[PDB]
Nucleic acid binder design. Structure first.
Length: 111
RNA sequence: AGGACCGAACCGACUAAUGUUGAAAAAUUAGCGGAUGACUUGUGGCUGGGGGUGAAAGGCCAAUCAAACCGGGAGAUAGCU
RNA sequence: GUGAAGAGGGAAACAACCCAGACCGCCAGCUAAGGUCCCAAAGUCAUGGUUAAGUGGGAAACGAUGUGGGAAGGCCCAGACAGCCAGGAUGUUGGCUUAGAAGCAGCCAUCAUUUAAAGAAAGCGUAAUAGCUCACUGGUCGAGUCGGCCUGCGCGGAAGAU
RNA sequence: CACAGGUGGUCAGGUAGAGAAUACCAAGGCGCUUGAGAGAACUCGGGUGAAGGAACUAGGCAAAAUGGUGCCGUAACUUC
RNA sequence: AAUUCCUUGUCGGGUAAGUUCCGACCUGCACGAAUGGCGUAAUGAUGGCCAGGCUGUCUCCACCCGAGACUCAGUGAAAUU
RNA sequence: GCUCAACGGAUAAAAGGUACUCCGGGGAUAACAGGCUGAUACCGCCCAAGAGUUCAUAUCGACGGCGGUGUUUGGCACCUCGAUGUCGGCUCAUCACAUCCUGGGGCUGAAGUAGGUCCCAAGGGUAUGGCUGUUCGCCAUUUAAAGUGGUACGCGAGCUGGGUUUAGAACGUCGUGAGACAGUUCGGUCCCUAUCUGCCGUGGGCGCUGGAGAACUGAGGGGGGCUGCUCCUAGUACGAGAGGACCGGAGUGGACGCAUCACUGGUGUUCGGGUUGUCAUGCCAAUGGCACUGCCCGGUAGCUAAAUGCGGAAGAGAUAAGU
RNA sequence: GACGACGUUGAUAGGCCGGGUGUGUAAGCGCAGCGAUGCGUUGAGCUAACCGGUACUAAUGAACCGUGAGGCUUAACCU
RNA sequence: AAUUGAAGAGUUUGAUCAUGGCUCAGAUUGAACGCUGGCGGCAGGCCUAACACAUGCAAGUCGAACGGUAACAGGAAGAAGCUUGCUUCUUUGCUGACGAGUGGCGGACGGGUGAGUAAUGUCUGGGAAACUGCCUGAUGGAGGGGGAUAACUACUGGAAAC
RNA sequence: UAGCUAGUAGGUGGGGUAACGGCUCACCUAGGCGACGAUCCCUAGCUGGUCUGAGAGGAUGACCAGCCACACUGGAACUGAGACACGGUCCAGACUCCUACGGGAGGCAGCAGUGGGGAAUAUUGCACAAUGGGCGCAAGCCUGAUGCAGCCAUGCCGCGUG
RNA sequence: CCCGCAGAAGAAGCACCGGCUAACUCCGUGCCAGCAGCCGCGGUAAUACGGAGGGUGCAAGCGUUAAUCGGAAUUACUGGGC
RNA sequence: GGCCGCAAGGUUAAAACUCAAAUGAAUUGACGGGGGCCCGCACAAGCGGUGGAGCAUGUGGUUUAAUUCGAUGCAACGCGA
RNA sequence: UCCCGGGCCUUGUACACACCGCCCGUCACACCAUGGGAGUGGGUUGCAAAAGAAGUAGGUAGCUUAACCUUCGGGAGGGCG
RNA sequence: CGCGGGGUGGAGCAGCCUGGUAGCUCGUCGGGCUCAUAACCCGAAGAUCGUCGGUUCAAAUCCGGCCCCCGCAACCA
RNA sequence: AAUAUG
């Protein structure tokens, strides 16, 4: 039992939401704000994201600020206009899609 | 000695309940603050409306005030009900 | 086009839907839409069929020997289809990047003998032999049998709060 | 309004008490202009309470509790 | 932080358990030196947090004493329609 | 001779705040809520590559599809702006079943115990705290289980006013400023005596066919329907072992409901006693008034819980899913 | 309102008599002490609504409302 | 005849002399560890946990204080299996002794420990206000009576202790 | 650590101890101790000696012997000449054992020995033959005091390994 | 304690050797691996490491470590400075 | 930590740890943008050049299959050659 | 007199791998011990209260009691509480 | 359509209303100073003066367009 | 006032 607990396995990396960004905006703090439109799922704040262009991943990271208008809501559903920005991401281009995914741990047993 | 301390009258009105066509168009009950001071109160006077006064809230100026009341312009105007 | 500015009849109720434009009066008749078992005025009318779900009387993808009708086809008294009595093999335990494989998640072709017929292949599935059953085939029984197409009406899918 | 409100000054008894507090009384003035019964709900204003003692709640709100004189004693901190 | 959006930041103390609180870090969205900065004894019907005591605030409400309600007699409203 | 560009040109010549506000109107037009719709959401299903040591469908499920429910996030502005008080809590519920537990059953990659998933089932039950105004959520510790929803995101002519759209003030930020923020921070009046409908109770009138007093048959309607742990069977079945039953029977609890005061207690200002201050009955003694019953100590009945008795069932009939 | 008991051929209520329960050694008097105070008399006095008895007082004889043989038709019995 | 004995070196600087610290040669220990290891004598041997303990033993002894037979060692008496010289088994405290009990004296010595205690302590040097078993010296009493008790019997409370 | 002391300092009277005394009370007086270190804090048994040193000193207090204190922790009394009692009594605390669950029993800082500490220190031995105690007239009994042996090179000293 | 029996038979290790400090060369390693009390050795001739030969000290003991004094006239009264 | 002070600070006064020296003075030599004295195309006073121009030669650099190796401030660069 | 190189004497010095020397501190990196540090968690101990086993000492109505006194009925004294 | 100030060499300027070979700084590449480097000193490279039309003897400087940068603007998930 | 530094 002591051994089984020791294990730390998370077996799920399922996407929480997938969104495409369009019409980039400029921000002083993060350097960029990429306007987005969520096509599927729900976008969340602290959940990690995977930025990819043409099926290959241009950049990776975890969201710092999710803001729509001046509301700055922590959650955005699908087919609702949304806004996004992140630190350490220099180049925003249209046509790419950002994939957000939640992280969960399955847990482990000994045998 | 003291805009000192506790505490009646006196002045002030923080909390709670009652009252909410009430007894009262802001009070009663049980608590509470100051209470020799920037204190309080009588009587009379002065400051008059785009003006007054204001330890300043746009409060107060006769049960009212982001401009009193009364009369007149006046049957203002109202593309509105 | 109707209402708005049109009442009336029907659609249970329901301006705008259907039928139809109210001059007034009558205790007449024939009709429109819509109906004809009763509530509620008129067929429990007549004739040929469908459904058995209360479908009708809300709801799809999709599923199913529900049932009605129709045009063709495969197999079959040299014995079909479904039962029952049997056989179920040899190259071959098949070479094999193989610990072990002798059919199987693996390997590859998928060829080749004996035979009425039996696949280097169908499986619940072993420590490996297997134990067992099936495709295929013999005997028994003796007349229909198998499942695609077109189409009527039904079935499940079908769970909401007074 | 015959209104639980407001309204300046003067007079200041006995006992207990520091006291014009407060209680009980003297002098004096009052029982407040609807009463009678019933003794349920429930509300208003009060008293008491087993055990637990803030678990209530936005919040110790409200209640409860502390409550006087003399002596002893009295911390952090300080502009002493 | 009366200032901090993300946010209940992260760390430590308190609690069985603390989005508040107390003490730090500093990534100060958006403190900053008389539109004053940071301390500060005393003081406050001041804001937030904690302990003791204390108790019908509560678990969970019971009884009792008054004034209404209730009945009878007299007088006799109201908003509304 | 006019970018009178707002271009059929109101002046030659004009920008703002109002939460200190005010007037006239509007559901012609927003916010709360209803309604329509169902994209979105939630839920169920169709195809099944693949995962599952083999094996699609024990349990999951790519790539895509088709519905349901009216339930979140939205759309529209149809009801109400000569007024429908908005978040939550408290109190009080009621219904739906896509069932959290208990009851029944299939499959299981179901040994047993304990689970997974799906069907049938709404009778009953379905936690108290810490922090935050919060619902929610996180955390602590319980419980057989701490269901998911409707009901104007139930419920203010019932309560709360902490959140949040007033009037004070301040910080941060924005503007030159008045001020502003869907950014915080402190403080900040919750009216209404019930005609009708409804319900909880309790009466009067009349009828039921001559009138009257009793006892009933029971159409119909309501209440109740919860469950742990322990022991025996049995340390038996099962299982390598650890561990550990079904079926059936016997005890004792938690919550809830009804009754009751006999006990154990509370109350007990109508009973007795102690005692502070004062006045009075001439005074002493002994009593009485008043001061929250003056303050206290005990306590008769009655009422009542924390107190002690009992209940939920068994059995019968027809069935759901299943066999 | 109703509902239950009883109204003199009477225990309905109040009182009364006894008992219980409650409080817990009254008042008076005597004794001891200077006095407060104690002690004996004495578990005394007093005691609501409770328990068991008792007509002592009050529930008097009457009126009021309510009636006087109870429809028609048919069937089965009976003169 | 008897507390008759005194060592230095290395290192600061390019080198030198002072000042000055550090380091080493000596002896010693209630020692340990590392490696090795023949015998003997004497002495030493939980310095930390004053941390806690199994088991045996570490204080008993007097019959010459006293009532006593509970043990086995005799002697005595009796009854028997018999070998004619003995054993065997019940009586008797007659005795060598002695369980338990009353009494006397010792359990205040011996042994252990170094927790406390910076002075009711210790060491040293004085003092006066005391007692002191057993052991000694000195001068006299040891007269005469009474009422209890353990042990042991009769019961009874205990699981054991009592 | 510069101020510390109410029985505190002294007296009188009473009680108290075997004995002087604030030893312990009543009353009276305001003194007592302290810079020559009171009080408080930290550490520690002291001494003959041990070790070192030429000496003076320094460090040290095993074994041996004297004195003191302590006996699981805390507190108190009894018996007795002597104990405010190591293996005695009671009470309380912690701990362990026995139990019929009502209640009892136990204290290695004695000798051996074990757990545990730590770098590390011992045989659950033999004998009362001796020496010194206890009791007794004595025999004699008891004596983990003592005398001996075992163990380890721990130290000192002698000898061998030619 | 004494007598007899058999036979060199049964019995020597440890530190250290750069100076202090008695006692040296070679080989290997090459600021590597290690030594060390102090000052210091080793980066390709190491008497300083490791091994070997030789040697010195000491002996059932030998070293290291810890402990106290001495040296330390460096708490100095004896017996020092400013 | 105590005392003193309005403050700044004073006063009394450690330990852990770390280094193997620190310091004093003196000597020789070097150096000084220390002083004196003194010499040399060292400067001054002159004359003619280099650095530019074209070429030669040596070097570095670059490049290359090799551009052999060595010389590098004066004291290497028509150097060894 | 000035620049460069050199000699002699004298002077200063923290240079003696000899001024191309030596050498200070912030800051950045790593390690070590230590101070302050909201408080937490122990030891020991002062002061002011609570508590009162066992035992001893005092005071005792009650219960009980072989030795001694007696008028034989009980005392004196003891113990238990 | 909407304000400011500027365009010169690699970068930033001066030369402007005062119209005749465009000079002044940092960089660039050399040289000098030093034992050497930093620093400093002597020097050379380096241009349609934004781009055009106007205008003039010759316009860098003269006007207006095209155009660009900055300024505040005004935007600012 | 001419210069660090190595």
């Amino acid at each position: 039992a002591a051994m089984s607990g020791m294990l730390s396995p998370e077996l799920k990396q399922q996407i929480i939401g997938l969104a495409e960004v369009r019409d980039v905006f400029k921000s002083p703090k993060f350097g960029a704000i990429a306007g987005c439109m969520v096509t599927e799922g729900v976008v969340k704040r602290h959940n990690p994201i995977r930025v990819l262009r043409d099926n290959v991943v241009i950049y990776e990271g975890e969201l710092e600020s999710l803001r729509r208008f001046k509301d700055d809501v922590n959650e955005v559903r699908n087919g609702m206009e949304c806004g996004i920005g992140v630190k350490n991401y220099n180049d925003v281009r249209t046509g790419d899609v950002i994939e957000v995914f939640e992280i969960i741990e399955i847990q482990r047993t000994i045998a």
